[PDB]
Amino acid sequence: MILDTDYITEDGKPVIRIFKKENGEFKIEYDRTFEPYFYALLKDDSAIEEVKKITAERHGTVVTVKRVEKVQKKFLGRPVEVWKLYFTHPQDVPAIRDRIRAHPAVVDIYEYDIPFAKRYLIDKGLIPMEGDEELTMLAFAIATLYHEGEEFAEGPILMISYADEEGARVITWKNVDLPYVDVVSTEREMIKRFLRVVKEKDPDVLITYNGDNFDFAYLKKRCEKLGINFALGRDGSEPKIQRMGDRFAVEVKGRIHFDLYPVIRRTINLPTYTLEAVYEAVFGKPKEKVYAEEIAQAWETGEGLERVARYSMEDAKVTYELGKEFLPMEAQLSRLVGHPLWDVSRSSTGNLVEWYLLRKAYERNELAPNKPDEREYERRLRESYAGGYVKEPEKGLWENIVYLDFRSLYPSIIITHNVSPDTLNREGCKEYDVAPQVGHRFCKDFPGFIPSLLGDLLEERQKIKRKMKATVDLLEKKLLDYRQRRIKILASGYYGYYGYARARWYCKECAESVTAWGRQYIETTIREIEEKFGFKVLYADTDGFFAPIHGADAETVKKKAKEFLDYINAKLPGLLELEYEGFYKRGFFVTKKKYAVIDEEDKITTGGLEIVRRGWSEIAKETQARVLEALLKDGDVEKAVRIVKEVTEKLSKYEVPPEKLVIHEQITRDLRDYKATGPHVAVAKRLAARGVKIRPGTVISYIVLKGSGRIGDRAISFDEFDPAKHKYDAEYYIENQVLPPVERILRACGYRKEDLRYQK
DNA sequence: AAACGTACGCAGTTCGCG
DNA sequence: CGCGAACTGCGA
Ligand SMILES: [Mg+2]
Ligand SMILES: [Mg+2]
Ligand SMILES: [Mg+2]
Ligand SMILES: [Mg+2]
């Protein structure tokens, strides 16, 4: 099983290293024969001799063209003749490529910015994560001592915990009486002991939660101060910090650092993504969170450290359990895309599409298009196109509603109508499909590049869905549900890739053709279910819609819905399929992209509501959730009105605990780059003036106090809140937090928003 | 050296124009 | 004052 690939430079020459795990043994295979290259298109072949003489320089090394070779390939399906230029070192390509393109006889260059290790995996047809090999795993987490106004890693690490199949243990340099706690003398001995544990265990995978941005960077800075060689790699190397665009990632040579945070972020939809919320969402059991303030107080006073050690232990144990379930899912995606697990687990949907396209293009001798230059990139940003059809929702609290949607609308359209840049307006074709409204033609004589690959993706999702319904184990049912959803967003990401300004296979014509077909098919289905089956579509968004039959039983609606699915699916062509996704006894639709429904099991599912959004206090989210229950479950508008009255009265009389009034908002940039100052920016700017380090990603937890001025003038960081000297703004939390979310709900159901709050 | 898939949306805060 | 625009953050 190929784990990963990289390259090292040995005497000025690159050596490909293939990290593998075969027969329970970790092995490194060395390849010194692979040569870097890129392509160049010439006006006349006679100029290849002058192109060969082009040189460049790279930190003291003269770069020359090692060897050239003319090859016949295809560009967007059309035959093309290009020159393959070979070089000694992969870093020769960045140094010389601009000078080669600048030659007047060179029309353009291609495939000049593909990493050397990834190029090796593609050109050798090597697929990582293939086979039934078992990878050894070890999760770990750290607990630190923090104070406001300090620099990163200024305080020491207090505990290092780790967990595998043998259990979880904690290393610390203070005496904590717990059987899973090993006590050393100093922070240095604690770090060195953890380094020994990893070396003796020798795990293939190191599991963390947000280790890319916290745990590894913290251990690194501490090791520099204490003068510790943090040799976590199997080659003895230290963890290397890389920069994937605007985010940081940490690799450990010889192993795979599996950071669960970017995996869970894309796999599960949650309001917050703390480790505690993630563990409960997957396993159903709660996990206690111990904050940095309690950790600092327990360590410094010396009292209550057993609770900190248990929290640190649970961190490693929970991270291992989560890593056990999600590694096989991400391992399959690595097999599907053909990219290492380390990159796949953190890669964006766009790069996951492009890397698979790059591999398939090589297999088909298709020359890859380039990433756009600066002019073309900004040109693509300035152009857009129409998207999905969103109907203005009908007002009211409705009963006996079915939800019908397409199985995979955009991928189904791409395959059915052969939407591909190599098929767009292709001359001399014997059959083509014309997109409505936008009029783009797409050849149907041969399978397009992208349509020929989307079919296998949709097949993999249907196999996962088949095992999903058959599985009875509730856990395994949930992971497979997560897994097939990841395939859906990947296949759906092929459409968005057509409109991604940085995409190699950029095709705005392909993108708007997909959405135009999507708008036509959803509007056709809405028209047919209303005119032929007497339904009334209440709300529709892109690929699905909600609709009941006015004054019909639950059974009458279910039977007529299945009757319509038979009629409409016989009419719909190709791979397009409308599905029966659910029946809901009650439901209402506030605005576009905002709704709430309840099934026959009293399970409430919502979309775009304030309960799942950041920036609303808990007293507002909890009140909306209770109003949701009174309307959907009990059909009791008066009860929902009484709930809001009881809440606003408790707020006016200062009987609500201030912890439920905390608003959380994230700082997204450098504080100097904010053009407007809101409540969370004003609190951040005030904290930064006191020495607090505010960075992009810092979550501001503030509470609005009773006072004067704007809301930002009255807001203060909640850690500075003292209930003995501060009085929270009861009028603000009534009028601005609690009322608006429920006011819009009661208006949308057909009821006045008047007299919802308590008044004297 | 890589680099957020897309369009379609809502809604809070601030603040100036008419 | 009322409204809307700008800014801001994020949810098929
Ligand atoms: Mg790598
Ligand atoms: Mg952690
Ligand atoms: Mg654009
Ligand atoms: Mg059909």
Side-chain angles (χ1 to χ4, degrees), chain A residues 140-142 209-211 214-215 275 289 311 315 319:
Chain A
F140 84 94
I142 65 164
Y209 197 71
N210 202 35
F214 182 68
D215 302 57
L275 185 60
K289 164 71 172 179
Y311 164 74
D315 264 10
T319 302

Side-chain angles (χ1 to χ4, degrees), chain A residues 377-385 499-501 506:
Chain A
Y377 173 63
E378 309 187 299
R379 192 203 63 83
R380 293 162 178 197
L381 295 162
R382 296 192 307 262
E383 78 178 356
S384 194
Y385 56 95
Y500 181 33
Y506 179 83

Side-chain angles (χ1 to χ4, degrees), chain A residues 131-142:
Chain A
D132 256 325
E133 202 91 14
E134 239 164 71
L135 289 197
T136 54
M137 322 204 272
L138 177 75
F140 84 94
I142 65 164

